[PDB]
Design a protein that fits this description.
Chains A, B: InterPro entries: DgoD-like (IPR034593), Enolase-like_C_sf (IPR036849), Enolase-like_N (IPR029017), Enolase_C-like (IPR029065), GlucD-like (IPR034598), Mandelate_racemase_C (IPR013342). Chains A, B: Pathway: Carbohydrate acid metabolism; D-glucarate degradation; 2,5-dioxopentanoate from D-glucarate: step 1/2. Chains A, B: It comes from Mycolicibacterium smegmatis (strain ATCC 700084 / mc(2)155). The structure is a homodimer of 424-residue chains. The first copy, chain A, has 424 residues and is of the alpha/beta class. Chain A has 2 domains: 1-138 and 381-398, Enolase-like, N-terminal domain (Enolase-like, domain 1, 2-Layer Sandwich), CATH 3.30.390; 139-380, Enolase-like C-terminal domain (TIM Barrel). Helices cover 37% and strands 16% of the residues of chain A. In chain A, the strands form 4 sheets. A 7-stranded parallel beta sheet of chain A has the order 7-8-9-10-11-12-13, covered by helices on one side. In chain A, strands 1-4-5 form a 3-stranded antiparallel beta sheet. In chain A, a hairpin with a 2-residue loop joins strand 14 and strand 15 (371-373). In chain A, helix 4 (173-187) crosses helix 5. The radius of gyration of chain A is 21 Å and the shape is globular. The A-B interface holds A 2, 5, 75, 77-81, 84, 129-132, 136-137, 139-142, 277-278, 280-281, 284-285, 303-304, 306-307, 310-311, 313-316, 340, 342, 376 and B 2, 5, 75, 77-81, 84, 129-132, 136-137, 139-142, 277-278, 280-281, 284-285, 303-304, 306-307, 310-311, 313-316, 340, 342, 376. Bound molecules: chloride ion (CL) (2 copies) and sodium ion (NA) (2 copies).
Chain lengths: 424, 424
């Protein structure tokens, strides 16, 4: 079947999709009523198709098309070469670019964000053709299931002029505790994270303490997306001594983070000031953070995430995982990666509970007691449901949204709104 | 053929071998008349056998036996788990241990040295069962051939009371230049390295300059294995400005190296003060070195060498490759590793020209114009020649040597000899 023992790329089909998202609040705005993703179907001359998933902003879709064209005629095992071809096609790397990430995270490598979904799709094909799960291409699983956290948000009851969702509003500690109960009853999550930077620090600390009261054994994390000054951060950290497993991005920039970490009794984590390999040396020299949140979508795929993990282990940094609104292809890739990473022991973030649509056939990624069992089948372990894919693509065409824009969407509701920060 | 889609280890056969080595001089002594290696044949329930190669000191052979016992019943794709089992079996890691390396290099991880050959053998099986060359398990080749350097040594004409070899003595610049001509005529090497620390620095500089005169376009490297004080090193570096591609381990320890690097116009390289992952952070903080020499035999196999490469790239360090007396299994593994490493652009060291025996069937690893083409076949690309293996094992039994001991061997010839350093 494989002439010249060769299996190479013949093309890629990129399909933007949109799925319903509740009005989740963050420090820069509120989520739009649909979240956008792009599905990559990477086709080969063996007739095997690999899957990847990434952001769907306008400029990213154009880059994905240029990447797809550049890598036709390359072996799916030649991922080093494929990254270099993509770099050439994009005209090299670059920073200050926040696409797909709502301007929230603006320092990630453009080449890595574009390469990522193709690399994941390549590993999926490698696994299919060898009969091995993707975790076997990353040094093999070290655990049979991957634990995730409950990702809590302050939220309105409904998007303006729309039916309220089944969650209800969460705008204070009682509302946050109620949301946690509903989510944890359904999924079994053993660790809990709160998206903060929305209400005054003392009110978010109150929600944290209420969570601790309701869930005495659950590790807790708080993430205000850099909404605080370093002085305010140090007060929050002192006040939450012994309560948080870690505190993520309390304040903006490597210097401010280093200032806070010098006083904070819990470790600081980040997915804002360390989002690319070239930021690691400064973060290490300054002692800005103690925990790095991996994310294969912007670090450049699964093998490069494994590299990040080894760098963290070497330099004495803890390792967790960051997420954005995502579907089942991303989830499968996250699970294979975390399963194969010895030092990824923190529960991974996921936005899973907040969506109810998907592009893959069901059954391969069930949550049980807060964890997802790593698929043992060849490849990524999930397959496209073409009817579901077409439906979410049609939803994307109709919903009219073309870029993630939490701030712009908040402004369409509240014209004078600014994404100020820090706010406290 | 593979029940439960599983291919797992059933046992390992470890065969110590010995092959003839000339009286090559270094700063701590002279090579023994035979060099020792251990061949690993890693057997699986699929009837596929993987190959690895490592040192053969007494205590290492015992560790290899304990490792082999610990990993029976493990998938050859589960290399993360296999390392952890080996660590447990050895009772955890450790330093100050110089076995296999003649006390020259004493800070490498014991777990990594023991795991390495099993990891290489596992990748060999992975490649065989998937039909892929080992380079396809490391991100794929980025080059079709790997360039090596001419590794020159001062040497006596013969071991005491033995027939002189065909090289003759090399004890001065003319002798070193003659040795280079013979080696480069035969192999085509495009870069040249001199093992120094044997004669006074000004005489080794003279050999370096003679090499430059005879080979105007060849990159040159000098490595006195830390035989100099930092003050002496700075004089050598100043005197060889514009002549060396890099200067390896001029002086002992991270602090002294950092002192020298502050003044040296060429980059400093090492395989002595950075030989384990836990040494990287100090080397980086101190700016002790600009180039790290990889070596999969003591860094823990091929995937961990790929990790080292990514760390070097991230922290702005160049990457080369170190070698010790070795045979064709090691050579194949070195070639697949270097082929798949984008930032390994320096020519690799090899002791190849100094041996004339091997344990693998010939034809897969020819040198042409100084480089070895990466094998495209499944697995490592070399196979055991059982008659050759048995002959070199018989040679090991008869030669009586049980540990590499350059200093002890020099003392058996010259009782008052000391491995002093620095010497100048
Ligand atoms: Cl190719
Ligand atoms: Cl296993
Ligand atoms: Na975060
Ligand atoms: Na060296």
């Amino acid at each position: 079947s494989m002439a010249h023992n060769r299996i190479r790329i013949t093309g890629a089909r990129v399909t933007p999709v949109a799925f319903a998202d509740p009005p989740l609040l963050n420090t820069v705005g509120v989520h739009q009523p649909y979240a956008l993703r792009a599905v990559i179907q990477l086709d080969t001359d063996a007739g095997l198709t690999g899957l990847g998933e990434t952001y769907a902003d306008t400029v990213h879709l154009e880059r994905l098309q240029a990447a797809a064209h550049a890598i036709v005629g390359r072996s799916v095992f030649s991922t080093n070469v494929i990254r270099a071809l993509i770099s050439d096609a994009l005209g090299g790397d670059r920073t200050g670019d926040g696409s797909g990430l709502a301007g929230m995270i603006t320092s990630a490598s453009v080449v890595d964000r574009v390469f990522s979904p193709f690399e994941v799709a390549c590993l999926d094909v490698q696994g299919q053709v060898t009969g091995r799960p993707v975790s076997d291409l990353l040094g093999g699983a070290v655990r049979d299931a991957v634990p995730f956290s409950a990702y809590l948000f302050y939220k309105w009851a409904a998007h303006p002029g729309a039916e309220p969702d089944g969650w209800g509003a969460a705008l204070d500690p009682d509302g946050i505790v109620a949301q946690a109960r509903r989510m944890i009853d359904e999924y079994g999550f053993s660790a809990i994270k709160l998206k903060g930077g929305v209400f005054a620090p003392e009110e978010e600390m109150a929600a944290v303490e209420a969570l601790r009261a309701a869930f005495p054994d659950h590790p807790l994390r708080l993430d205000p997306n850099a909404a605080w000054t370093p002085q305010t951060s140090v007060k929050v950290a002192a006040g939450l001594e012994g309560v948080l497993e870690y505190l993520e991005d309390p304040t903006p920039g490597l210097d401010g983070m280093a200032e806070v970490a010098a006083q904070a009794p819990m470790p600081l984590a980040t997915n804002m000031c360390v989002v690319a390999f070239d930021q690691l040396p400064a973060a290490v020299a300054k002692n800005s953070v103690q925990v790095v949140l991996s994310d294969h979508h912007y670090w450049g795929g699964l093998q490069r995430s494994r590299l990040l993990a080894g760098i963290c282990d070497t330099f004495g940094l803890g390792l967790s995982m960051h997420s954005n609104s995502h579907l089942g292809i991303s989830l499968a890739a996250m699970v294979h990666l975390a399963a194969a990473t010895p030092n990824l022991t923190y529960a991974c973030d996921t936005h899973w509970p907040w969506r109810h649509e998907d592009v893959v056939a069901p059954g391969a990624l069930n949550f049980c007691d807060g964890e997802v069992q790593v698929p043992a089948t060849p490849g990524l372990g999930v397959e496209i449901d073409e009817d579901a894919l077409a439906a979410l693509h049609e939803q994307y065409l109709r919903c009219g949204i073309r870029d993630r824009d939490d701030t712009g969407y908040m402004r369409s509701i509240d014209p004078g709104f600014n994404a100020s920060g820090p706010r406290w």
